[PDB]
mmCIF file of all heavy atoms in Angstrom:
data_model
loop_
_atom_site.group_PDB
_atom_site.id
_atom_site.type_symbol
_atom_site.label_atom_id
_atom_site.label_comp_id
_atom_site.label_asym_id
_atom_site.label_seq_id
_atom_site.Cartn_x
_atom_site.Cartn_y
_atom_site.Cartn_z
ATOM 1 N N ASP A 1 105.243 135.422 103.550
ATOM 2 C CA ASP A 1 106.371 134.826 104.281
ATOM 3 C C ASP A 1 106.041 134.658 105.769
ATOM 4 O O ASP A 1 106.926 134.671 106.628
ATOM 5 C CB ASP A 1 107.671 135.620 104.071
ATOM 6 C CG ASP A 1 108.922 134.789 104.316
ATOM 7 O OD1 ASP A 1 108.795 133.591 104.644
ATOM 8 O OD2 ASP A 1 110.034 135.337 104.175
ATOM 9 N N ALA A 2 104.754 134.515 106.080
ATOM 10 C CA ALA A 2 104.271 134.186 107.415
ATOM 11 C C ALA A 2 103.486 132.887 107.428
ATOM 12 O O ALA A 2 103.774 132.000 108.239
ATOM 13 C CB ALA A 2 103.407 135.331 107.966
ATOM 14 N N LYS A 3 102.496 132.752 106.545
ATOM 15 C CA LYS A 3 101.752 131.509 106.396
ATOM 16 C C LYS A 3 102.270 130.661 105.245
ATOM 17 O O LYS A 3 102.224 129.428 105.326
ATOM 18 C CB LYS A 3 100.265 131.802 106.183
ATOM 19 C CG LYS A 3 99.570 132.398 107.393
ATOM 20 C CD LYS A 3 98.093 132.628 107.117
ATOM 21 C CE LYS A 3 97.395 133.243 108.319
ATOM 22 N NZ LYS A 3 95.951 133.488 108.052
ATOM 23 N N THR A 4 102.756 131.299 104.176
ATOM 24 C CA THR A 4 103.360 130.562 103.071
ATOM 25 C C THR A 4 104.667 129.905 103.490
ATOM 26 O O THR A 4 105.023 128.846 102.962
ATOM 27 C CB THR A 4 103.600 131.492 101.883
ATOM 28 O OG1 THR A 4 104.519 132.524 102.262
ATOM 29 C CG2 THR A 4 102.293 132.126 101.435
ATOM 30 N N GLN A 5 105.388 130.521 104.430
ATOM 31 C CA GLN A 5 106.584 129.902 104.990
ATOM 32 C C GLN A 5 106.234 128.638 105.766
ATOM 33 O O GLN A 5 106.983 127.655 105.732
ATOM 34 C CB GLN A 5 107.313 130.904 105.884
ATOM 35 C CG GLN A 5 108.644 130.421 106.432
ATOM 36 C CD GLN A 5 109.344 131.477 107.261
ATOM 37 O OE1 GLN A 5 108.819 132.572 107.463
ATOM 38 N NE2 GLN A 5 110.536 131.154 107.747
ATOM 39 N N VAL A 6 105.091 128.645 106.455
ATOM 40 C CA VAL A 6 104.612 127.447 107.140
ATOM 41 C C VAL A 6 104.232 126.372 106.128
ATOM 42 O O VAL A 6 104.517 125.184 106.328
ATOM 43 C CB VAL A 6 103.436 127.811 108.069
ATOM 44 C CG1 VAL A 6 102.841 126.574 108.732
ATOM 45 C CG2 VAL A 6 103.892 128.801 109.125
ATOM 46 N N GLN A 7 103.618 126.779 105.009
ATOM 47 C CA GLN A 7 103.278 125.838 103.944
ATOM 48 C C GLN A 7 104.523 125.240 103.302
ATOM 49 O O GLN A 7 104.508 124.078 102.880
ATOM 50 C CB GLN A 7 102.425 126.532 102.883
ATOM 51 C CG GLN A 7 101.075 127.013 103.381
ATOM 52 C CD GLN A 7 100.157 125.874 103.770
ATOM 53 O OE1 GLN A 7 100.118 124.837 103.106
ATOM 54 N NE2 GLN A 7 99.409 126.060 104.852
ATOM 55 N N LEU A 8 105.608 126.014 103.224
ATOM 56 C CA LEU A 8 106.879 125.453 102.784
ATOM 57 C C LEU A 8 107.475 124.534 103.842
ATOM 58 O O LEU A 8 108.135 123.545 103.502
ATOM 59 C CB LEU A 8 107.853 126.576 102.438
ATOM 60 C CG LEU A 8 107.453 127.417 101.224
ATOM 61 C CD1 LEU A 8 108.378 128.602 101.066
ATOM 62 C CD2 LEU A 8 107.449 126.572 99.963
ATOM 63 N N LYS A 9 107.255 124.839 105.124
ATOM 64 C CA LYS A 9 107.705 123.951 106.188
ATOM 65 C C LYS A 9 106.861 122.688 106.285
ATOM 66 O O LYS A 9 107.332 121.684 106.830
ATOM 67 C CB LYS A 9 107.701 124.681 107.531
ATOM 68 C CG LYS A 9 108.792 125.727 107.670
ATOM 69 C CD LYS A 9 108.737 126.400 109.029
ATOM 70 C CE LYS A 9 109.813 127.464 109.160
ATOM 71 N NZ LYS A 9 109.761 128.142 110.483
ATOM 72 N N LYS A 10 105.629 122.712 105.769
ATOM 73 C CA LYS A 10 104.831 121.494 105.704
ATOM 74 C C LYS A 10 105.322 120.543 104.622
ATOM 75 O O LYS A 10 104.968 119.360 104.647
ATOM 76 C CB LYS A 10 103.360 121.834 105.462
ATOM 77 C CG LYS A 10 102.672 122.489 106.644
ATOM 78 C CD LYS A 10 101.218 122.791 106.336
ATOM 79 C CE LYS A 10 100.540 123.477 107.510
ATOM 80 N NZ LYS A 10 99.115 123.790 107.217
ATOM 81 N N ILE A 11 106.127 121.029 103.685
ATOM 82 C CA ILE A 11 106.643 120.198 102.606
ATOM 83 C C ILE A 11 107.756 119.311 103.144
ATOM 84 O O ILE A 11 108.757 119.802 103.680
ATOM 85 C CB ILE A 11 107.144 121.069 101.446
ATOM 86 C CG1 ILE A 11 105.990 121.882 100.863
ATOM 87 C CG2 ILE A 11 107.794 120.208 100.376
ATOM 88 C CD1 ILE A 11 106.429 122.955 99.900
ATOM 89 N N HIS A 12 107.582 117.997 103.002
ATOM 90 C CA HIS A 12 108.617 117.045 103.383
ATOM 91 C C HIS A 12 108.766 115.928 102.359
ATOM 92 O O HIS A 12 109.480 114.954 102.627
ATOM 93 C CB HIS A 12 108.320 116.445 104.759
ATOM 94 C CG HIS A 12 107.075 115.617 104.796
ATOM 95 N ND1 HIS A 12 105.819 116.169 104.920
ATOM 96 C CD2 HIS A 12 106.891 114.278 104.716
ATOM 97 C CE1 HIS A 12 104.914 115.206 104.919
ATOM 98 N NE2 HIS A 12 105.539 114.048 104.796
ATOM 99 N N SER A 13 108.120 116.035 101.203
ATOM 100 C CA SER A 13 108.123 114.970 100.211
ATOM 101 C C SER A 13 109.368 115.076 99.334
ATOM 102 O O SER A 13 110.299 115.837 99.612
ATOM 103 C CB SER A 13 106.841 115.020 99.385
ATOM 104 O OG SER A 13 105.703 114.771 100.189
ATOM 105 N N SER A 14 109.396 114.301 98.250
ATOM 106 C CA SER A 14 110.529 114.277 97.334
ATOM 107 C C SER A 14 110.276 115.120 96.089
ATOM 108 O O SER A 14 111.030 116.054 95.800
ATOM 109 C CB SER A 14 110.848 112.831 96.937
ATOM 110 O OG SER A 14 109.796 112.275 96.167
ATOM 111 N N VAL A 15 109.219 114.812 95.350
ATOM 112 C CA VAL A 15 108.922 115.485 94.092
ATOM 113 C C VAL A 15 107.984 116.651 94.364
ATOM 114 O O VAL A 15 106.892 116.466 94.913
ATOM 115 C CB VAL A 15 108.310 114.511 93.075
ATOM 116 C CG1 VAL A 15 107.835 115.260 91.845
ATOM 117 C CG2 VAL A 15 109.321 113.438 92.699
ATOM 118 N N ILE A 16 108.403 117.851 93.978
ATOM 119 C CA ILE A 16 107.593 119.051 94.125
ATOM 120 C C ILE A 16 107.004 119.394 92.766
ATOM 121 O O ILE A 16 107.740 119.625 91.799
ATOM 122 C CB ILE A 16 108.414 120.222 94.684
ATOM 123 C CG1 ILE A 16 108.953 119.868 96.070
ATOM 124 C CG2 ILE A 16 107.565 121.481 94.742
ATOM 125 C CD1 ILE A 16 109.995 120.829 96.585
ATOM 126 N N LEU A 17 105.678 119.426 92.692
ATOM 127 C CA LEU A 17 104.956 119.754 91.470
ATOM 128 C C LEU A 17 104.455 121.187 91.596
ATOM 129 O O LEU A 17 103.602 121.481 92.440
ATOM 130 C CB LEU A 17 103.807 118.777 91.244
ATOM 131 C CG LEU A 17 104.256 117.330 91.031
ATOM 132 C CD1 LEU A 17 103.056 116.398 90.952
ATOM 133 C CD2 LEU A 17 105.121 117.215 89.786
ATOM 134 N N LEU A 18 104.989 122.073 90.763
ATOM 135 C CA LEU A 18 104.722 123.499 90.854
ATOM 136 C C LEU A 18 103.888 123.955 89.664
ATOM 137 O O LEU A 18 104.146 123.555 88.523
ATOM 138 C CB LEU A 18 106.031 124.288 90.916
ATOM 139 C CG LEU A 18 105.917 125.794 91.134
ATOM 140 C CD1 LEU A 18 105.233 126.070 92.459
ATOM 141 C CD2 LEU A 18 107.289 126.446 91.088
ATOM 142 N N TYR A 19 102.886 124.793 89.935
ATOM 143 C CA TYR A 19 101.984 125.295 88.897
ATOM 144 C C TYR A 19 101.804 126.795 89.106
ATOM 145 O O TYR A 19 100.972 127.218 89.916
ATOM 146 C CB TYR A 19 100.646 124.567 88.935
ATOM 147 C CG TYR A 19 99.724 124.944 87.801
ATOM 148 C CD1 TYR A 19 99.933 124.442 86.522
ATOM 149 C CD2 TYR A 19 98.652 125.806 88.005
ATOM 150 C CE1 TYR A 19 99.096 124.781 85.477
ATOM 151 C CE2 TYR A 19 97.809 126.153 86.964
ATOM 152 C CZ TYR A 19 98.038 125.637 85.704
ATOM 153 O OH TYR A 19 97.206 125.975 84.664
ATOM 154 N N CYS A 20 102.572 127.593 88.369
ATOM 155 C CA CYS A 20 102.535 129.048 88.476
ATOM 156 C C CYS A 20 103.100 129.643 87.191
ATOM 157 O O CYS A 20 103.248 128.952 86.178
ATOM 158 C CB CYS A 20 103.303 129.524 89.711
ATOM 159 S SG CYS A 20 105.044 129.099 89.695
ATOM 160 N N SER A 21 103.410 130.936 87.227
ATOM 161 C CA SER A 21 104.030 131.606 86.094
ATOM 162 C C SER A 21 105.545 131.440 86.182
ATOM 163 O O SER A 21 106.064 130.713 87.033
ATOM 164 C CB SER A 21 103.629 133.077 86.050
ATOM 165 O OG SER A 21 104.216 133.793 87.121
ATOM 166 N N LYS A 22 106.275 132.121 85.302
ATOM 167 C CA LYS A 22 107.726 131.992 85.293
ATOM 168 C C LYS A 22 108.361 132.794 86.424
ATOM 169 O O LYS A 22 109.211 132.279 87.161
ATOM 170 C CB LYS A 22 108.277 132.434 83.937
ATOM 171 C CG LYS A 22 109.762 132.188 83.754
ATOM 172 C CD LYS A 22 110.206 132.552 82.345
ATOM 173 C CE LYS A 22 111.688 132.282 82.146
ATOM 174 N NZ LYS A 22 112.144 132.632 80.772
ATOM 175 N N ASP A 23 107.950 134.056 86.578
ATOM 176 C CA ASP A 23 108.518 134.909 87.617
ATOM 177 C C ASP A 23 108.100 134.454 89.007
ATOM 178 O O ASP A 23 108.889 134.555 89.956
ATOM 179 C CB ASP A 23 108.103 136.359 87.382
ATOM 180 C CG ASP A 23 108.701 136.936 86.115
ATOM 181 O OD1 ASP A 23 109.801 136.496 85.723
ATOM 182 O OD2 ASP A 23 108.066 137.824 85.508
ATOM 183 N N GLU A 24 106.875 133.941 89.142
ATOM 184 C CA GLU A 24 106.460 133.336 90.400
ATOM 185 C C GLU A 24 107.266 132.084 90.707
ATOM 186 O O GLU A 24 107.569 131.820 91.875
ATOM 187 C CB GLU A 24 104.967 133.015 90.363
ATOM 188 C CG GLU A 24 104.078 134.243 90.380
ATOM 189 C CD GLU A 24 102.607 133.900 90.281
ATOM 190 O OE1 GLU A 24 102.285 132.713 90.058
ATOM 191 O OE2 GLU A 24 101.771 134.816 90.429
ATOM 192 N N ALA A 25 107.647 131.322 89.677
ATOM 193 C CA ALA A 25 108.524 130.176 89.888
ATOM 194 C C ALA A 25 109.909 130.617 90.337
ATOM 195 O O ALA A 25 110.527 129.959 91.179
ATOM 196 C CB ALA A 25 108.617 129.336 88.615
ATOM 197 N N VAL A 26 110.398 131.739 89.798
ATOM 198 C CA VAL A 26 111.682 132.287 90.235
ATOM 199 C C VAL A 26 111.609 132.724 91.694
ATOM 200 O O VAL A 26 112.527 132.460 92.483
ATOM 201 C CB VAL A 26 112.109 133.441 89.307
ATOM 202 C CG1 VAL A 26 113.362 134.133 89.824
ATOM 203 C CG2 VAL A 26 112.356 132.920 87.903
ATOM 204 N N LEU A 27 110.492 133.346 92.087
ATOM 205 C CA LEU A 27 110.306 133.766 93.476
ATOM 206 C C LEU A 27 110.221 132.573 94.424
ATOM 207 O O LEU A 27 110.822 132.586 95.507
ATOM 208 C CB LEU A 27 109.049 134.627 93.601
ATOM 209 C CG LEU A 27 109.072 136.003 92.938
ATOM 210 C CD1 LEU A 27 107.704 136.659 93.026
ATOM 211 C CD2 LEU A 27 110.135 136.883 93.574
ATOM 212 N N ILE A 28 109.497 131.525 94.023
ATOM 213 C CA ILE A 28 109.341 130.346 94.870
ATOM 214 C C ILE A 28 110.657 129.581 94.985
ATOM 215 O O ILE A 28 111.021 129.117 96.073
ATOM 216 C CB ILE A 28 108.189 129.469 94.340
ATOM 217 C CG1 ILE A 28 106.851 130.177 94.568
ATOM 218 C CG2 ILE A 28 108.159 128.095 95.000
ATOM 219 C CD1 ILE A 28 105.687 129.542 93.847
ATOM 220 N N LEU A 29 111.417 129.480 93.889
ATOM 221 C CA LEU A 29 112.721 128.825 93.961
ATOM 222 C C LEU A 29 113.727 129.642 94.761
ATOM 223 O O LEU A 29 114.572 129.064 95.454
ATOM 224 C CB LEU A 29 113.260 128.550 92.558
ATOM 225 C CG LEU A 29 112.555 127.443 91.774
ATOM 226 C CD1 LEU A 29 113.099 127.366 90.357
ATOM 227 C CD2 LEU A 29 112.710 126.110 92.484
ATOM 228 N N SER A 30 113.638 130.975 94.708
ATOM 229 C CA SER A 30 114.516 131.807 95.523
ATOM 230 C C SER A 30 114.180 131.677 97.003
ATOM 231 O O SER A 30 115.082 131.641 97.849
ATOM 232 C CB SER A 30 114.417 133.266 95.077
ATOM 233 O OG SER A 30 115.234 134.101 95.880
ATOM 234 N N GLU A 31 112.889 131.583 97.332
ATOM 235 C CA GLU A 31 112.499 131.371 98.722
ATOM 236 C C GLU A 31 112.856 129.967 99.197
ATOM 237 O O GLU A 31 113.202 129.778 100.369
ATOM 238 C CB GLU A 31 111.000 131.642 98.883
ATOM 239 C CG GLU A 31 110.481 131.565 100.313
ATOM 240 C CD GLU A 31 111.027 132.662 101.212
ATOM 241 O OE1 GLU A 31 111.348 133.758 100.703
ATOM 242 O OE2 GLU A 31 111.140 132.423 102.433
ATOM 243 N N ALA A 32 112.806 128.980 98.299
ATOM 244 C CA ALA A 32 113.170 127.615 98.665
ATOM 245 C C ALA A 32 114.673 127.479 98.872
ATOM 246 O O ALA A 32 115.118 126.736 99.755
ATOM 247 C CB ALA A 32 112.684 126.643 97.591
ATOM 248 N N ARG A 33 115.470 128.181 98.063
ATOM 249 C CA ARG A 33 116.909 128.212 98.291
ATOM 250 C C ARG A 33 117.249 129.002 99.549
ATOM 251 O O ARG A 33 118.202 128.659 100.259
ATOM 252 C CB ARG A 33 117.619 128.802 97.072
ATOM 253 C CG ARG A 33 119.136 128.748 97.137
ATOM 254 C CD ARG A 33 119.772 129.260 95.859
ATOM 255 N NE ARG A 33 121.227 129.279 95.958
ATOM 256 C CZ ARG A 33 122.002 128.233 95.701
ATOM 257 N NH1 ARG A 33 121.457 127.083 95.331
ATOM 258 N NH2 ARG A 33 123.319 128.333 95.814
ATOM 259 N N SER A 34 116.471 130.046 99.849
ATOM 260 C CA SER A 34 116.679 130.798 101.081
ATOM 261 C C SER A 34 116.289 129.986 102.310
ATOM 262 O O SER A 34 116.895 130.147 103.375
ATOM 263 C CB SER A 34 115.887 132.104 101.039
ATOM 264 O OG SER A 34 116.356 132.952 100.004
ATOM 265 N N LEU A 35 115.290 129.113 102.186
ATOM 266 C CA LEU A 35 114.855 128.269 103.288
ATOM 267 C C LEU A 35 115.445 126.867 103.231
ATOM 268 O O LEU A 35 115.079 126.023 104.055
ATOM 269 C CB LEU A 35 113.326 128.188 103.320
ATOM 270 C CG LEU A 35 112.607 129.494 103.666
ATOM 271 C CD1 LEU A 35 111.103 129.327 103.552
ATOM 272 C CD2 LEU A 35 112.993 129.967 105.059
ATOM 273 N N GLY A 36 116.346 126.599 102.289
ATOM 274 C CA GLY A 36 116.963 125.290 102.208
ATOM 275 C C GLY A 36 116.069 124.197 101.675
ATOM 276 O O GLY A 36 116.309 123.021 101.957
#
C-alpha cells in the first residue's frame, strides 16, 4: 500500500483485466473500493 497504491493511481483506463487468485481478487477489489 505504498508502491501498489501508486500502481492503482496509475490506472486511468476503462476495462481492468485482473489475473490472480480468488482471495487476492477480494483484496484488490476491497482496496479499489477503498480508493474509489
Side-chain angles (χ1 to χ4, degrees):
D1 203 0
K3 292 181 181 179
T4 62
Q5 185 178 2
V6 176
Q7 296 294 321
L8 294 173
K9 289 181 181 179
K10 290 180 181 179
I11 298 169
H12 65 279
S13 296
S14 67
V15 172
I16 299 168
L17 297 174
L18 185 61
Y19 186 76
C20 62
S21 69
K22 187 176 181 180
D23 294 331
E24 290 177 353
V26 174
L27 292 174
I28 290 168
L29 288 175
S30 178
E31 185 67 29
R33 186 176 177 85
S34 296
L35 293 175

